Symmetry: C2
Subunit: 391 residues, 2 copies
């Protein structure tokens, strides 16, 4: 008889093959979308360069960075001595009537210029957590003494300059969360205002992060040729945007599983307990028109030849894609790939070119080799990798 | 001490006036958006015509109707005899691999061509409710024997041809709702797929409704010069899109309060019980870039000189705006305005040029003269109005 699980796969019940539910129709439209800059193997060197440029042109188009009639320059509003380093807090002015902030950790007795690492936090997290400090308000505080959280502090302890930014709507940029909701920031309401205005959450937060990157390129004590961007979880998204736009960034740390998000939205259709087909993520992740151009594997692939480390798996297919682009760029060895420990042995993975439809969140994570309870900044892989690439 | 209500109004706490919360910044961006085709009084006849054309060009741009390599023509799949009329069900094929449906009520013994009314239902509702029939599935059934619901049936009883359509994701176009959620259709997940693809829920459902309108213009028994579009609640949105795009539509029934939705999003900032500032409506209502061009009062104003009736209030300011456009078009008398009975006496209304910020849903509805428990299709105003305008 009736079985909700028999509705997991979306398909026509008509002899003519046509789809009647709007869900099915729009889902099919996504299945029928062939991204323009999907990476293809076997390109000539000229074709590769042109593809890489096309990816950048598409990113510029969809991110809609404004040209802002110059606002005042960034200003240091606080400096404190810590055990072995200095903590600076800076204000910057991205638009009229607006202010944003970032933190800078400088090693004590810094002589000549050293590598700088732009640290971008995860969902529910803040720059204070990244530098190992309590929250700006108590309800916004993270497990800041855990080295799995304090990415920026870890970087200053390696002798690098660490710059910690917030994600839009979170931390010091939050609204009423300090009174109740805490880490559960209302990113979506902010995203809606931006979307209404033709923009997006990622376009906005990336535009702000670009100003911090520009500030880092102007510091005499930061090696302009050794700027790294390290993103944890959500933070990998603005890192991708900055990396595509700025070819002079030296290296990248991608601390989230590498997701082919178009496929995910096509395959994750199994109804949940509420009899809904939840979208894989919220409008915080909506950049209109993105999938007409590319997916994350194509985007990160275009960062070639910059050294890049992936510390939390994804499908073998997508690692192969990135590896092929790196080979075409002439530095196949610059991209390094790791799986979650649970899936490090390929005997336990399913290496397929296409995922099956009818997945739910649990089965999708299983298919793409993700172990959510072990999601955290992989210092054990990143610190040694950076020691080697930054020489 | 602390009081949540003291956070209702968004404002700077800095001497330099700058805003730190992303909510406040993006909210200010909306406040600073000046729609390009906002209606202005005192335009020359040439300026008025050019403004009207500009509104249409902007609508075309933001609605992104596709050019579809011709699919098969609509097909009648069922015809039934009813008491005094015939009920026809039709299939149409808007895209490859897709099917949609509509219902047609024809008066019995129809001789020559008669006026046709395209009936567009409200949120949570269906074409079956509009024609006075039970749902396609039991959980989708409405109070279909209530004349306040059965708009289309009411129209056929007046001797007009009534054509009833669905809204995307609702009714026969629904997905899993017939098993549990019922009237609570997941419009938003459908909207997300469309938004990802550069489109929108309204762009989609309007594109489908345009095909039904095109079908009505081809029927020999429908007076091509007497096609009316009547929208209830949500249905007023596709009516606006079709009216702007097709100047040959004869008249409009706007059965929802006339909302200046940009202002609403700016003023409705009072935190709710969850300490959130809920957006006035969901992404079903997101058409990216709409507010860069216009608001609903400007859009309906551009329908001039077509006869139009507003049956459920709004601000006196916005009725004045529409009236001014109708005067400029040369038929000031073609636009007719009504308030909810509760607010019909201007002594109880507040006629202001700008609403105060810090409203919540309850206080906003109070400010704009809306009485939600009395929201329903106003036959008592519409039937007599149509009798007069359709002569």
């Amino acid at each position: 008889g009736y079985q909700p699980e028999k509705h997991a796969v979306v398909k026509s019940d008509r002899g003519d093959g046509r789809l009647l539910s709007t869900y099915a129709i729009v889902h099919e439209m996504l299945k029928d979308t062939h991204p323009q800059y999907a990476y293809r193997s076997g390109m000539s060197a000229q074709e590769f360069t042109q593809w890489q440029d096309g990816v950048r042109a598409a990113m510029v188009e969809i991110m809609k960075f404004p040209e802002i009639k110059r606002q005042p320059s960034p200003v240091c509003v606080k400096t404190e001595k810590k055990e072995g380093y200095i903590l600076e807090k800076w204000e910057f002015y991205p638009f009229p009537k607006s202010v944003s902030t970032f933190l800078v950790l400088k090693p004590e007795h810094l002589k000549g210029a050293v590598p700088g690492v732009l640290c971008i936090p995860g969902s529910g997290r803040t720059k204070e957590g990244l530098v190992g400090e309590p929250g700006i308000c108590d309800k916004l505080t993270e497990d800041y003494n855990n080295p799995k959280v304090s990415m920026a502090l870890n970087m200053v302890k390696e002798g690098y300059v660490a710059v910690a930014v917030d994600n839009a709507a979170a931390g010091e940029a939050s609204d009423l969360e300090c009174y109740d909701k805490g880490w559960n920031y209302d990113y979506d309401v902010v995203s809606r205002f931006l979307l209404e205005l033709g923009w997006s959450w990622l376009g906005y937060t990336s535009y702000l992060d670009m100003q911090v990157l520009n500030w880092m390129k102007a510091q005499s004590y930061i090696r302009k040729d050794r700027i790294v961007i390290s993103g944890f979880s959500l933070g990998t998204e603005p890192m991708m945007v900055l990396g595509v736009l700025d070819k002079d960034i030296y290296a990248f740390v991608y601390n989230d599983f590498l997701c082919q998000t178009q496929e995910r939205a096509v395959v994750m259709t199994k109804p949940d307990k509420e009899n809904r087909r939840p979208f894989p993520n919220s409008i915080r992740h909506l950049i209109p028109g993105y999938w007409r151009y590319f997916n994350f594997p194509d985007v990160v692939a275009s960062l070639a030849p910059r050294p890049i480390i992936f510390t939390e798996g994804g499908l073998d297919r997508d690692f192969r894609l990135v590896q092929s682009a790196y080979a075409a760029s002439g530095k196949p060895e610059n991209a390094e790939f790791h799986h979650y420990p649970k899936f490090a042995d390929k005997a336990v993975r399913k290496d397929v070119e296409h995922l099956d439809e009818g997945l739910d969140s649990k089965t999708y994570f299983e298919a793409v080799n993700v172990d959510p309870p072990s999601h955290y900044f992989k210092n054990e892989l990143v610190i040694p990798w950076l020691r080697k690439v930054l020489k």
